[model samples]
Target: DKKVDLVYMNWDSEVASINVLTQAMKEHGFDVKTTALDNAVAWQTVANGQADGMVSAWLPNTHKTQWQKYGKSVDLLGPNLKGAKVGFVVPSYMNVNSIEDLTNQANKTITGIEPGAGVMAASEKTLNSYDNLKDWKLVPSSSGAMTVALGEAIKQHKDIVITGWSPHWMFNKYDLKYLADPKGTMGTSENINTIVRKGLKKENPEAYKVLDKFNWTTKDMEAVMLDIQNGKTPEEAAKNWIKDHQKEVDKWFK
Candidate 1:
C-alpha cells in the first residue's frame, strides 16, 4: 500500500540485518527500497525525511554525537539488537592486554574507519584523554582497509591497534581482545536501534509494525553475517535465515 525507503550503512553486519528487514518488509506488502549511505548521512537522511528509517543506529555510545545533533528530528524506535560494543582491539597473540599497554609500543597508531564514524570519534577522544595515547594517531581508512592492515600485522605478529566494534566479522575471523577502557572513553556495551523519520509509523503502519517488531539477538545476526563472510550473498543468507526462522519471523506480523 505504501513505499518504504530504508537507508543503512554499507558495513558488514548492518548490510546483513538491514537486508533481512528489507526482504521481510517487501513480503509484508511494502514497496521497499534500500539505499546504502555512510553513517552520518543515514541519520540525517531519515531525520530530514529523505528516507523513512534505518535499522543500523549503534546507540548510546558509537552514535552519541549524531544523536545529540539529530535526536529530536527522529523517532528512536528502540533496540533491534543488543549487546553491541566499540573499543580498541588487538590480536589475542599480543602480549599487551590493555589500552594502557599500547603506550609502551613504538607504533603509537590505530587504524580506523571513516572519519565520521562514531567509533572513530570515540577513539579520538580516547587518544586525546588517555595520557599514554596523547601522542598516538588514528589512521583513517575504510573498514576493509583497516581489516587488511590488521590481518597483515597479525600475520607478521606485529603490534597494531584498530578501532573495533562488536557484531563485526573481525572478531569471528581472528582471536581479538578489546583493550580495557579504564577511562570509559569507549563507552559501554550499547543497543543497536531502529530509528525512523518522525511520522513514519502513521504514514505506513504495516511497514512500521514490522520495523517495530524487528528484534533479534547477536547470535541471530552473527549467523547471517558469518554466512555472508563465508560465501553466501547478503540476500541468500537472509533468505536462508528467514526460511529457517519462519516461526520467529512470523511473530512480527502477529
Candidate 2:
C-alpha cells in the first residue's frame, strides 16, 4: 500500500491542477490525500514533512520569501505551468494607467486576497515604495470578497485597485489592466512549479515521476478553471480535462 500527501492552496487553478494530478496518481495505485491550506502554510507543510509536495509554487518573485526560507528542504521538481504573473490590476476604464498614476484618487484603497498571500506582501511593499501611495491602504479580504468588490466597482465604473494574478478567471470575465510597476516591486512574469519534499523521490518514486512530468500551459489551466466557474465541481472539471488530454497525462508515467 502506498500513499502520498499533496498540500495545495485554495486558488482556482491550483485546485483544478491538483485534482487532475490526484486523479492521475490514483490511476497509478496511489492513495492520494490532499490538504488545503493558505499560501504560506502550503510551503511550510511540505518543508516540515507534514505533506509530500505541492503543485502551486509561484516564482521567481511571488513566493520568493517562502522559497528562500524552506526551498532548501524541498526539491523544486520544475514548473507545472508558465506565463503566470502578479500585480496590481484595475478596470481598463479607469483613467489611471500605472501604479504611479494612483495618486490623487478619490478612493486610495487597494483590495487584496488573504494577508498571507505573496501578492499581499508585495502589495504592502508597493504601498511603501511609492510616495503617492503612502496614505493608501491594502484591504485584506478573501478571493471571493475581492472579486465581489471588483464586480461592484466595475458595475459603477469606479476606481479601484486589486492585487491580481494571471491564469485567473477574472481576467476573462472582466476587462482589466495591470498597472505598470517601474520599480519591479510586483515582480515579472512567473512560473508555477511542483515542489516535493526532499525524500519524496525515494519514498514514492512513481508519484514523484508523475508530478515531475506535470506541465501545462496557462490556456490549458484556464479552460478547466472556466469549467469550475461555470458550475462544474473541481473534481468533475479535472476529470473532464484529463479525459480530453490523456496523451499529455500519459507522458508523465513514460
Candidate 3:
C-alpha cells in the first residue's frame, strides 16, 4: 500500500469509475484505494479526510453549495469530464416536450433519484422557481429503484417524469429526453471535476501527479459504461479501452 497510496471516493452511480481507475492505476504501478458512498457522503468523506481524492464533483450549480462549504478545505483539481447534463428527464415516448408541459398532466409528480443528491436538491429548487412545478411533487427513490420504477411505467406507457443526468449508462440503454427547463434551473450544461483533500499533494506527490493528469473524453467514459452495462468487467473494459486509445494513453502517461 506504500506505492504512493491514495484513497478515492465517489457516488454509488460512479462506482464503475473506481474499477476503471483501478485498472489504470495497476497498469501504471500505483497503489490506490477506492471508496463508493452516497453523493453527500462522497463530499463528507473528503472534507473529513477519510479519502485522498475523488472525481465525482458534479458542478458549477448542482453541487455549488457543497463546494462553497468545502472549497477552502479542499483543492479542486481539473475537470475529469465535460458536457455533463444533470436535470429532469423523460422517455422519448412522452408527449410532454418541456418542464412547462408537466402542468397539463393530472398528477404532476416528478420521479426522482435519491433524496439528498445535489441533482435532487437542484430539482426541488428549480421546480419551486416555476409556477408550473409548485405543487408538483418530487418523489425520491434510489437510482436503481427509480429506474426500475421507470421501466415498469414505461412498459405500461405511463406519463412519467424523473430526475436524470448524463455521462450515465442509462441514457445509452434507453431513449430519453431532458425536458427543456425554461427557467434554466439545471445551471446550463456542466462538467464533473476532481477534488483532492488538503495536504494530499504533500503526502502523495507521485500519485497526486498521476491523478491530476487523469482526464477523459465523453467517448472514453461511454465505452467503459457500456461495457459494465453489457456485463463485462470494468477492469477489462478500461484495459481494452486503453489498448485501443494508445495515443491518448501515451499523451497522458508519457
Candidate 4:
C-alpha cells in the first residue's frame, strides 16, 4: 500500500520514458509517484532506498560508473528500452563517417553535455587518443543547450558536433549519425534499463512484474519524445501512446 517515489533525469529521452512509465503504471492500476532530478541523484535515490525505482539507467557504457558502484545495492529489472548509442555525432550532411575523419571542423569544437557526463568523459578520451582531435575542444553545456546549438546549426545548415545519443528526439528531428569511433573510446550501443531498490519484488510482486515486463524499442520511445518536444505534455503524450499501443501495454499486467 506504499507509494514509491520513482525518480528520473532531465534528459529529453528520460523525460519521455518516465512519464510514459508513470502513465503506463497508472493505466495498470498503480499509484506510483515520479520526480525529476540530476542524473547522479536519480541513481543514488534508488540505490539508497530513498526512492523505490527508476527507468533511466543507460548501460553498460553510458552509466557504467554509477552502476558499478551502486549495482550491488539495487535491483536491476532489465532493459525497458534498447538500441541506444552515445558519441561524437555530426549532421548527416557533414560527410564524415568516423571521428578520425575530422580535423579542424565545427570550429574545432564538440558541443557537450554536463562536463561530468559519461559521454563527455568518453569524448575527452577520444580527444586524447586521436591526432585529429588534438586541437579540437569538447565544449561543456547542458543537454538542452547542446540541442539548441544543434537546432541553430541545422536551421542554418552549418556543421556541428554534438555529444549525442540515440532513442532521442534529435535523431528524429534532424539528420545525424554517430562518427564511428573505431577506437571504441566512447563505448557502444547500450540499453535504457529499469532499476529498483533492493527487495522490490518481495515488497510488491505485481509492481515488480510490471516493471519487469516493461520493454520497448527506439521508435516507441522516440515517438513519445518527439511529441513531448513538439510541446505536448508528457502525460498527454503518454496517454496517447498507451491508447495507441494497447496490446503492448496489456502485456505489463497479470
Candidate 5:
C-alpha cells in the first residue's frame, strides 16, 4: 500500500474531516496515517513535507496568519469544504452582542481553543484593540474543554464567551450568537481549505489528485459532526458518511 501521512488539530471539525478523508484515502489503495496536532504544527507538518496534507486549513480568517507563514512552501489544494466561519461567540441569553460591549464577563477571560490557533491570535488583537478588554485574558483550552465549560455555563445560566467557529456541532447543540467584531479582528467569512506538502503532486500523483478532488459543503460536514456529537464514534460516523456518499467518494478515486 502507498503510504500517506496527514495531520490535523483535535478540533471537532478537523476531527470529522480528517476521519472521513483518511478513510477515503485508505480505500484508494493507500495506507493513511492521520495525526492530531496543534493548529500551528499541523501547518508546519505539511509545509516541511513530513506529512502529505490536511483538510483543516480555515482561511481568510481563522488560519490567516498560518497561510501567510506557510502558504508559499505548501501546496494549497483549496477548500475541501466551504462557507465556514470563526469568531468569538456568546450564549444568546447574554445581553452582550458585540466585543466592544463586553465588561468583566467569564471572569474577565475568553475561553479559547489551543494557543497556537489563529483564532487566539485574533482574540489577542481584539483584547488589545478594545479598551473594554484591556485586563481580559484569553484562557487557552482544547475545544472539547471549551464546549464542556460552555455546556456547564448554559446549564447554570451563566455568562461565557468562547472562541467559536462554524461547521461545528456546538451550534447545533446550543443557542449561540456571534459577538460582533467592530474592528473585524476576529475575521469575517472563512473557508476550510485543503493544504498539502510542496512537491506532493510530483511525489504522489494519485493521492494528490484525490485530495484535490475532495470537496463538500458545511451541511455535509455537519452531518458527520452531529453524528459524532450524538454518541457515534468518529470512525462510525465517518464510515456512515462514506457509505451514504459513496457516489462522491467514488469520484475522488476516479
Candidate 6:
C-alpha cells in the first residue's frame, strides 16, 4: 500500500497553526510533511496536485482569485481559526484612526506584502472603489520586507501604512491599529480555513478526523507565539502552550 501521509503547506502568518497541527497529528497517528508557501503558491500547489493540503486560505475576499481558479479542485473543510482579520494598518501612535485619514499623511501610498500576496490584491481592490484612493499606490515587498519598513518607521515614529492582519505577533510587538475600512474592500473580517486535496480521509481516516476537528483561539495562539518570540523552539513552545491551554486543546481533540 502507498504511504499514509500528507503534505501540509501554509503561509508565514500561519506557522503557529502548523506547529499545533504537527503535534496534534503525531498524537493522531499521521506522518505529515510540511512546506511553507505564500498565499498564491499555497493555493496553486494544492490545486495543481503538487501538494496535498494547506491551512492558508483567506476567505470571502482575500485570495479570491486563487479561490476562483482552484476552488473546484480543492475541498474546504472548515475554519481552523476565527476572529481573523486582514487590512491596512499603522502604528497606533501615528495619530490616525482610519483609511480615509491616511489620504495625505500616508503620501497616498500603502506599504504592501509580496507581489501576488492576498493582502496586496486587497489593497489594490480597496483603491479601485474609493476614487480618492486613485492616487494611492501600493509599494510591493515581502511580509518581512514590510515589517522591516514598519520597524524602521516605528523607530523614527514616522507615519507609515502597511497591509496587515490578525493573530500576528507584530500587533503585540508594535503599537499598531488597522485602518478603518469604510469601503470594506479589505474584507474587514474573515476566518482562516483548512483545505485538502480529494480522497485524504481514505488514506488516513484517524488523522483526517483530528484535522477536521482542529480549532484554535487567539489567546491560545498568542501564547505559543510569545514563546517563539522569546527564542523557544516552535515545538517546545507549542507543547508548553498546549499544557497551559489544555482545556481548549482538549476541546479540539475531543
Please provide, for model 5 over 20-113, each residue's C-alpha lDDT reduced to its tens digit, 9 standing for 90 to 100: 9888877677888888988888898898899989888888778878889888989877877777877889999999998889997779989997
Task: Estimate the Cα RMSD of every predicted model relative to the unseen true structure.
Answer: 1.2, 1.2, 2.1, 1.5, 1.5, 2.3
> lDDT values of the candidates?
0.86, 0.88, 0.75, 0.84, 0.87, 0.76
Error of 3 at 210 (Å): 1.4
Q: Give the TM-score of candidate 2.
A: 0.96
Give candidate 2's error at residue 203 in angstroms.
1.7
Ranking by lDDT: 2, 5, 1, 4, 6, 3
Query: Where in model 3 is the C-alpha error above 4 Å?
Result: 1-13, 104-106
Q: In candidate 1, what are the lDDT values of residues 112-223, reduced to their tens digit?
A: 9988888999998898887878788988998778889998998898888888888887777899999899888898868999998889888877777878888988888889
Candidate 1 — which pairs collide?
none
Whole-model lDDT, model 5: 0.87
Clashes of 4: 0
- Please give the distance, in angstroms, between residue 193's alpha carbon in candidate 4 and its true position after superposition: 1.2
In the range 1-254, model 2's lDDT, one tens digit per residue, is 87889999888878888988888778777899999999889999999888989999999889988998998989998888978999999998888888988886647888888888888888888899999898899989988899999999889888888999988999999999999999989988789999998888888787788888989888888989999999999888988998899898888878
Which ten residues in a row are the worst by lDDT in model 2? Answer: 101-110
lDDT of 4: 0.84
Better of 1 and 2 by lDDT: 2
> What is the C-alpha local distance difference test score of candidate 1?
0.86
> Each model's TM-score, in the order given?
0.96, 0.96, 0.91, 0.94, 0.94, 0.90
Off by over 4 Å in 2: none
Residue 81 in candidate 2, Cα distance off native in Å: 0.7
Candidate 5 vs. true structure, TM-score: 0.94
> Which parts of model 5 are misplaced by more than 4 Å?
none
- Among residues 3 or more apart in sequence or in different chains, the pairs in candidate 2 whose N, CA or C atoms overlap within 3 Å are none
